[PDB]
Amino acid sequence: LICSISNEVPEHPCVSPVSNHVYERRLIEKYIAENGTDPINNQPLSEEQLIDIKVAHPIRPKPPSATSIPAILKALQDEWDAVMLHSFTLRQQLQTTRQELSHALYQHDAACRVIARLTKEVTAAREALATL
Amino acid sequence: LICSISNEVPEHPCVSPVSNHVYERRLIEKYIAENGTDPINNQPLSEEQLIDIKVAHPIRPKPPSATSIPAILKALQDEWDAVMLHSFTLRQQLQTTRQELSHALYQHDAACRVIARLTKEVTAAREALAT
Amino acid sequence: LICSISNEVPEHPCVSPVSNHVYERRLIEKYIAENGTDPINNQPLSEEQLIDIKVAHPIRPKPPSATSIPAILKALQDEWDAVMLHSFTLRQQLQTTRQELSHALYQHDAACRVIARLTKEVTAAREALAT
Amino acid sequence: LICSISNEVPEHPCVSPVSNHVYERRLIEKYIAENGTDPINNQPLSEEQLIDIKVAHPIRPKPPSATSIPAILKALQDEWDAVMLHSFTLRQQLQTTRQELSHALYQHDAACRVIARLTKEVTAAREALATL
Amino acid sequence: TDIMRNEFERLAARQPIELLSMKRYELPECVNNSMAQLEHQAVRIENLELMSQHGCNAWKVYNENLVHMIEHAQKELQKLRKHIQDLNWQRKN
Amino acid sequence: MTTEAKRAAKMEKKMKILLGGYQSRAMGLMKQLNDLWDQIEQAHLELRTF
């Protein structure tokens, strides 16, 4: 759609066969006549090496759409590759919650033995003192 | 802008250095392994001989009613219908071209015999006026 | 063998240099485009930092079987149907492990308030024993 | 499924994080202790730089399955790849034969006008000579 | 001149039957089918968010590309038109 | 199911009137290519015949 040298919409696109990036024929031709090189990569290129854009041959194409079978298959990659990252958001957050639950239930199991002894000791002090 | 094998709009176009023509990498890679030569010009070409090209990338707007459901059911069904009924109809077109070839060459050779027959006729009629 | 983001076998793996971890080129790029960081170590990493690793041999294609093609349509349907539930079940479990963790934190801080009153009953007892 | 030092099937595939090309833990470790370098690229590499052991964690094992899903789409691409290659060669011969059809039909009716001319001249020679 | 592809394709066209894709995704064993509908619906509603964010700007940007693509074809229609009439012009003389 | 179905379908026709012009525009353009690419190829005949 654009010419990489000028930045215009090229009216005669010709693609190079060394550092291809669709150039305008009239622009690239002058670049070759200046010095036999490709403007981007600075690799050697002649005018015969450059090739105009063409209809493929005899197989008829249709424009790139959502229906087209290959475009539909690359779509289903995007679906699954995104959903695979959705699983990491829940696998990584699960490893924090279960790690905080493990330390929480351990602090609960370490503390409730001290609640059981104070309920013993404060009642034993009431059982001892009241009898005297 | 298109590929010169399938009639695609390539996602990773690559150009061959023997014949300046852009192909989609998968389809040109397959041809070289089948028979190591350029498909169009029939010139010697290898996988290392190819040159990958870069462009601003191609964008397809995935339809508004796009889900796993239509993409699995309705869209994929239409794609293998459209592949099936086209190539069958294309095989029908190739069969008639060969039949209509035979009617062309026969009618041509039929005309050649008329000319050859009339070439003897005319000049001898002109010769008879001279005599 | 496994990219540590999706769980796939990577077809163009790339390794991060801040933390030794072979990711897949597509997935690591999307993460860096979201935020310039490494997903495991959270260290400042960029796209130019990545070194494309080479793994030519491991690539091994699945040859499902002679398997009928209309059936392969319903397999891909079932496999997406399964992965959708295998992603769902792994997220509700994360929410309930965090939820049950929050119930432990209330009991943890509620218990250490109950120890303060029990220490007072012991302090009151030590004063009475002295008298 | 091969190490890139000895050529054995690696039972503990570790990789270097400079020019990874999956090695085996024993051989790469012996190369590092010999001289701190990567054997393939001769870059700087140490023992801590290596990523050892298998990776499966928070993933679930799916041994390259026959009735799975991701490879079905890959198979759907591979069969389409042929569909396009077939349609091209079928179209080339379609249009390349149409050139022979077109050039013939044109040249046929062109050669047909030779007769129309020839017939009327032949006819003129008859009445001329006859009346003379 | 194709592999297995041609055998099943010609059989599908001859028999006049398309291969059935079962993705019970729509209806919903149904505990799974239900959980499928949720994740794809959440992916759907996220897939409609990133479209509406850009909105019509992403569409009309591609519409401009299609006009650059079209005009190039009709320039070649003219170049062929001129050289075709130019050959006939020489024949006439 | 039905909530996100009613969400996404209303989300669809949010886009389907927005893109639906451009859907019809792109269909009108894609026809116009396929109109020309006969006459492109029809011209490719009448070079080499002529």
Half-sphere exposure for B125 (CA within 13 Å, toward CB)? 18
Angle, helix C25-34 to helix A69-131, in steps of 10 degrees = 60
Tokens representing D97?
Answer: 């034969």
Q: Which three-class secondary structure state does DSSP give residue C5?
A: coil
Task: Please name the member of A55, A60, A63 whose beta carbon is closest to the beta carbon of F30.
Answer: A63
Instruction: Give the Cα separation of D16 and C17 in Å (integer).
Output: 11
Instruction: Give the Cα separation of E90 and E92 in Å (integer).
Output: 5
Residue with tokens 């933390």: C19
Stretch (H or E) spanning F11: helix F2-48
The answer to whether C36 touches C45, Cβ cutoff 8 Å, is yes
Instruction: Give the Cα separation of C123 and C126 in Å (integer).
Output: 5
User: Which of C69, C79, C81, C5 is closest to C37 using CA atoms?
Assistant: C5
User: Which of B23, E78, E70 is closest to A9 using CA atoms?
Assistant: E70
Using the beta-carbon criterion (under 8 Å), do D86 and E6 form an inter-chain contact? yes
Residue with tokens 């999307």: C30
Tokens representing C125?
Answer: 């007892």
Chains C and F touch (3+ CB pairs under 8 A): no
The answer to whether D6 touches D12, Cβ cutoff 8 Å, is no
Q: How were these coordinates obtained?
A: cryo-EM
Chains D and F touch (3+ CB pairs under 8 A): yes
Strand residue runs (E) in F1-50: none
Residue with tokens 């639906």: F20
Instruction: Tell me if chain E has a CB within 8 Å of the CB of B67.
Output: yes
Instruction: Give the Cα separation of D9 and D23 in Å (integer).
Output: 10
Tokens representing B50?
Answer: 């190819």
User: Which of A19, B67, E36, B78 is closest to A5 using CA atoms?
Assistant: A19
Q: Which three-class secondary structure state does DSSP give residue B60?
A: coil
Residues in chain C: 131
Instruction: Tell me if chain A has a CB within 8 Å of the CB of B93.
Output: no
* Resolution value (Å, 1 decimal): 3.3
Q: How many CB atoms lie within 10 A of CB D10?
A: 20
Angle, helix E4-14 to helix B74-130, in steps of 10 degrees = 90
Task: Please name the member of A20, A71, A79 whose beta carbon is closest to the beta carbon of B51.
Answer: A20
Instruction: Give the Cα separation of F44 and B5 in Å (integer).
Output: 18
The answer to whether A39 touches A23, Cβ cutoff 8 Å, is yes
* Diameter of chain F measured on Cα atoms: 65
The answer to whether B24 touches D81, Cβ cutoff 8 Å, is no
| Strand partners for D15 | D51
The answer to whether A71 touches B60, Cβ cutoff 8 Å, is yes
User: What's the helix, strand, coil split of chain F in %, to 5?
Assistant: 95, 0, 5
Distance linking the first and last C-alpha atoms of chain D = 102
Instruction: Give the Cα separation of B63 and A91 in Å (integer).
Output: 31
Half-sphere exposure for D25 (CA within 13 Å, toward CB)? 9
**What is the torsional sign of CA A27, A31, A33, A36?**
negative
Cα of B14 vs its chain's centroid, Å: 20
Question: Which residue type sits at A70?
Answer: P
Tokens representing A37?
Answer: 């090189």
The answer to whether D2 touches D8, Cβ cutoff 8 Å, is yes
Task: Please name the member of A81, A89, A105 whose beta carbon is closest to the beta carbon of C104.
Answer: A105
The answer to whether C24 touches C12, Cβ cutoff 8 Å, is yes
User: Which of F36, E76, B21 is closest to A12 using CA atoms?
Assistant: E76
Strand residue runs (E) in chain C: 13-16, 21-24, 51-52
| Strand partners for C21 | C16
Q: Which three-class secondary structure state does DSSP give residue D117?
A: helix
Helix (H) and strand (E) counts in chain D? 2, 2
**What is the torsional sign of CA A93, A96, A102, A103?**
negative
Distance from CA of B114 to the nearest CA of A (A): 36
Q: What distances in angstroms separate CA A15 from CA A5, C76, D52, E64, E87, one per listed residue?
A: 13, 40, 47, 21, 28
The answer to whether C16 touches C39, Cβ cutoff 8 Å, is no
Q: Which three-class secondary structure state does DSSP give residue A24?
A: strand
Tokens representing E20?
Answer: 């059935």
Q: Which residues contact C118 (CB under 8 A, 6 or more apart)?
A: A114, A115, A118, A119, A121, A122
The answer to whether D103 touches D110, Cβ cutoff 8 Å, is no
The answer to whether B14 touches B51, Cβ cutoff 8 Å, is yes
Q: Which three-class secondary structure state does DSSP give residue C52?
A: strand
Chain F interface with D: residues with Cβ < 8 Å: 41, 44-46, 48-50
Q: What distances in angstroms separate CA F50 from CA B101, D95, D104, F46, one per listed residue?
A: 18, 15, 11, 6
Cα of F12 vs its chain's centroid, Å: 18
User: Which of A108, B58, A59 is closest to E61 using CA atoms?
Assistant: B58
Using the beta-carbon criterion (under 8 Å), do F45 and D102 form an inter-chain contact? yes
Instruction: Give the Cα separation of B116 and A10 in Å (integer).
Output: 55
Stretch (H or E) spanning B51: strand B51-52
Instruction: Give the Cα separation of E51 and D9 in Å (integer).
Output: 48
Stretch (H or E) spanning D13: strand D13-14
Question: Which residue type sits at A110?
Answer: A
Which of C26, C73, C74, C81 is the best mutation test for B, with the most CBs of B within 10 A? Answer: C73
Q: How many CB atoms lie within 10 A of CB B75?
A: 22
User: Which of B8, B16, B7 is closest to B47 using CA atoms?
Assistant: B16
Q: Which residues contact C50 (CB under 8 A, 6 or more apart)?
A: C14, C15, C16, C17, C23, C25, C28
Instruction: Give the Cα separation of E72 and A2 in Å (integer).
Output: 12
Question: Which residue type sits at B44?
Answer: P
Residues in chain D: 132
Q: What residue spans of chain B are helical by DSSP H?
A: 25-34, 68-72, 74-130
β-strand pairing of A23-24 with C21-24? unpaired
**What is the torsional sign of CA C20, C21, C22, C27?**
negative
User: Which of E24, E47, C49, C78 is closest to A86 using CA atoms?
Assistant: E47
Domain extent, residue B43, equals: 1-131
Number of folded domains that form chain C: 1
Q: How many CB atoms lie within 10 A of CB C78?
A: 20
Give burial (CB, 10 Å; 0-12/13-18/19+) of B124: exposed
Cα of B122 vs its chain's centroid, Å: 46
